[PDB]
Design a protein around this ligand. Structure first.
Ligand SMILES: NS(=O)(=O)c1ccccc1
Length: 290
């Protein structure tokens, strides 16, 4: 964990440059340095206390550009720094961190829906491709549990997916896992205790409030309590043993709602609102800035 939940970028009318940090200990929001380039459909992660913004797309008045960018935010300095770019642009990307390395998974580049996966090494500032997924996935949820990488749901270019797969680093190999009970593109995916959670998303007809979790020991998905708001393209993270979901789109509104899940009581509650409604944000947790 750390201290603050950082939300970077997103979409409302066009792609956003916002970086804002929510503090669960006092309810406060802080606006921090803007991204250098607006982006929606990006992912956030943390390595060595630095916040990384990965991929996305700049949907803007003057044009639409898919992003291969990796950028690094240092809370100590309140400055963004560019890192090496990925091999390819990846809008509606998923990311996971294992052993201080960032895995970028799937996403789109125009009509190209990627199965490709690449890994960034911060000590070298270098990306390298690894084995591709067995399925093309954009709007894909990614999480890490016990140093294995999970890619969950998404859209393959033709169908929204209930399927999911796992990457075994030491074998450089992807294998299918049990599919979810619900088709979901754009779900929030995270890890808590021994389970991979998939919250919300879009099933082809409707934005979802349902939430299900995969127990790696049993290989089964089980529904838990649904969110209070239906939402796709939500941000998600974990902070002190609770899941937080941030924004997204419900078919009517770009949500400012932030919900918090308590796994012991199996209940969701609203904890704050974002300063403005948005979908397609990048979210991660690190130390408070100066
Ligand atoms: N990342 S976003 O702009 O919220 C988006 C979400 C779903 C489909 C297309 C775009």
């Amino acid at each position: 964990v750390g201290r603050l939940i950082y939300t970077a970028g997103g979409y409302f009318r066009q792609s956003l440059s916002y970086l804002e940090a929510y503090n669960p200990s006092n309810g406060s929001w802080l606006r921090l340095a803007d991204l250098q380039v607006p982006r929606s459909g990006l992912a956030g992660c943390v390595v060595g206390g630095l916040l990384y913004a990965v991929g996305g797309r700049n949907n803007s008045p003057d044009g639409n550009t898919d992003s291969s960018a990796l950028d690094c935010y240092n809370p100590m300095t309140n400055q963004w720094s560019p890192c090496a770019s990925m091999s390819v642009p990846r809008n509606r990307i998923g990311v996971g961190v294992i052993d201080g390395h960032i895995y970028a998974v799937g996403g789109s580049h125009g009509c190209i829906h990627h199965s490709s996966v690449e890994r960034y090494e911060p000590e070298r500032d270098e990306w390298h491709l690894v084995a591709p997924m067995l399925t093309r996935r954009i709007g894909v949820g990614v999480a890490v549990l016990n140093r294995l990488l999970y890619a969950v749901g998404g859209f393959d270019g033709t169908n929204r997916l209930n399927s999911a797969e796992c990457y075994y680093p030491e074998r450089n190999e992807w294998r299918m896992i049990t599919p979810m009970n619900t088709i979901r593109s754009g779900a929030g995916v995270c890890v808590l205790h021994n389970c991979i959670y998939a919250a919300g998303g879009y099933d082809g007809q409707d934005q979802l409030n349902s939430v299900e979790r995969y127990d790696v020991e049993t290989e089964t998905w089980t529904f838990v309590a649904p969110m209070r708001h239906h939402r796709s393209a939500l941000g998600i993270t974990v902070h002190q043993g609770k899941i937080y979901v941030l924004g997204g789109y419900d078919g009517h509104t770009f949500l400012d709602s932030v919900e918090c899940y308590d796994p012991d009581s199996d209940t969701w509650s609203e904890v704050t609102r974002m300063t403005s409604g948005r979908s397609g944000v990048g979210v991660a947790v690190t130390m408070e800035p100066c």
